[PDB]
Assembly symmetry: D2
Homo-oligomer: 234 residues x 4
């Protein structure tokens, strides 16, 4: 039993409230730069992740209760050539000792190991023919790169996106939405996810992003703010 909440209107560099993995770094301007950028231009074969320093308990094996949580964040994906973008950004939950995985289409969160249990909401900017639908899309993933559900997403180059994710334990319902406040455009996806049968009791959480493996298929993956709140009933 327990709870956890926080709010970061921007990110302060060199402060242990985040666990940086791969190429992820925090700029002097307070931006969480998940993937490498060289003189404004994003580089290929990049992978970066950022987890909150502390994990939270998503379910209790003694009481059998499951936590409900919500998280919101703003991010920007900018690309020199809007026709060739890759690979995407994601919010995910995984074991406390989670480490970055495969590059590119794997979004750094997938590589079946029963110890690599993961739930994620993906903002996929490149469709992989072997497991992805057509065009860019939002997706909800459980233990593999192939989403259990997807919906079309009209990505807007360099535009600020506001994301909201919520999980209602009582109905095992995970909802994810993305809005471009400046454009008044919005997208949403929902799926049943039984976290109790997927993830361990305690999990770390945060962001993961990668750029394309092939030249030209690059993009930035910057998070600008982040708030979180969970509650595990006693």
């Amino acid at each position: 039993t327990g709870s956890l909440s926080f709010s970061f209107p921007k990110f302060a560099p060199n402060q242990p409230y985040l666990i940086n993995q791969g190429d992820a770094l925090v700029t002097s301007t307070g931006v969480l730069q998940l993937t490498n950028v060289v003189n404004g231009v994003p580089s290929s074969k990049s992978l970066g992740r950022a987890l909150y320093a502390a994990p939270f308990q998503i379910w209790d094996s003694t009481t059998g209760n499951v936590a409900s949580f919500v998280t919101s964040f703003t991010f920007i994906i900018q690309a020199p050539n809007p026709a060739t973008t890759a690979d995407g950004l994601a919010f995910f939950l995984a074991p406390v000792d989670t480490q970055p995985l495969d590059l590119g289409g794997m979004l750094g969160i997938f590589k079946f190991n029963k110890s690599n249990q993961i739930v994620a909401v993906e903002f996929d900017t490149f469709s992989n023919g072997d497991w992805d639908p057509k065009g860019r899309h939002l997706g909800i993933n459980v233990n593999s790169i192939e989403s259990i559900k997807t919906v079309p997403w009209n990505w807007t180059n360099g535009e600020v996106a506001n994301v909201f994710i919520s999980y209602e334990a009582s109905t095992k319902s995970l909802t994810a939405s993305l809005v471009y406040p400046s454009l008044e455009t919005s997208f949403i996806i929902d799926a049943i996810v039984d976290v109790k049968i997927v993830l361990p009791e305690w999990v770390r959480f945060g962001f993961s992003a990668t750029t394309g493996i092939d030249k030209g298929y690059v993009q930035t993956n910057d998070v600008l703010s982040w708030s979180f709140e969970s509650n595990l009933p006693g």
Copy 2:
């Protein structure tokens, strides 16, 4: 400056935390029944509203600050004949002394009086040819029955819907989403709404719903739970 938050997993009847208007009532089972139902069958020409007992400050004239808030609720709209439904349910904000207005298509929140300023998210089950798009839809309204923006909505007879509404003062962005957790279907709408130039400093808020004026065009409008949270920066 200030804040307000609450959570009602269900509604308790005969308790002054809600201000009931029109035909609205709370059943012994804890359901907020906005419109009249006779032996299971909803009646026509019904109008009911429910406001939280206390208002909250949505903006401060001294500091110029604007509040950000979120609210979520679950509701059910059941109809004997799914082909003829009317009129809809809405979440709205208005002056503290707000009273029910016109029936039917007006959703009990519209009737231009500068004192009847109102912002609302509507779940419209009947398209009025004079100001509504085709088919059922979600809508964001500011001072009139004609929404500033709408999106198609596939209403599911008697299914439990989860709604989430959020307002980010910094971007004047109002987002509204509806999900049917059991069906994994979802809808969303977003629009710019400058509450500071629309509503007074303090406002009351809650639900309003009406049934059709013509025989046959009836439906229930039941809210099952409600949580709210606002914050006006100092």
Copy 3:
């Protein structure tokens, strides 16, 4: 089951978030003036109360659960003659339809009617020989003017006091503390209070204060800010 929280750094006049009773009023400066003041001088035989507009559920008869809550507020008690002060200020919980009771020593919250169940923390500025200890004191009262426990209080004329009250359902422990931030002085009291066996499921709450009945025994009773938070486990 449910929750309620709010924060008022100051009070806005003419806004229905408070239910004013007796002589209570909100000044243009945002001060909650519980008892009458004439040209700076407090008058005798005054009684004023202020309740939050909405009640909250303090315990659930179906689940048997009891809520835990905390509240904090700042207040000032100023008197022309610091040697003759009366009668006091209190924070209390009572049935939703609670109305002001007796003046003076009764603090407007006591008058045995099983329907007038009340729990209160009193900041008593005058010792009534028939039921009060010696000198000014903090007190915890349950159903009567005679406190179940008291502790000495060194009241400081016109000084700003910060009060904190907390109730832990699991241990039925009610704690009340008063601090004069400017003077670094502090006082505290604690007592077991079984709210489940004392109060009804839903209760309204707030402040009550009275001035002395005899000439000269007067004082102001002004609250400057107020925050509250309760949680009833499901």
Copy 4:
């Protein structure tokens, strides 16, 4: 700018939400055992600390704002010989890289290094003649083992104590209180502490405790639960 809150009704062992230092450990029963215990009997020369995994921002150098926070926890101090107890338990704030310091009377948080800035509330069970008052006492410390203020404390062997600490930035007021819910006894202390001029922008926080250096002067220092909440205005 930002915020952080959490609640742990008990502690789960082997989970990275806490940073354990010195002899501190979490028992299978969920108790945070700060100092060594051998077969029920606490050992001497022990020192243990526990910090939340993530730090929080206590003040912003760009806006100049200072955070307000509150924390509560329950703890037990049990001793074989209630006549000889040492040394104490404390809640403290310090730089993110804080490491345990001196044993015994230094409570593991003191050793003047401008980089070892620290603010702490101490529950001192042994009076050190060179800097402590008479008998056990609560204390508020800023940069040294000599408290800026103390108050007598009647420690009760093995009894469960509830502690509440609050800091109001606007008045730079730090309040600390201890209550024995079962006994209805209570103690409190308050002092002005300008965290902005004492601590760095970001700080880690938690508990520290030590046992006596001389044989016989031992005691357990167990924390049973912990909740925290801070808010740094934008």
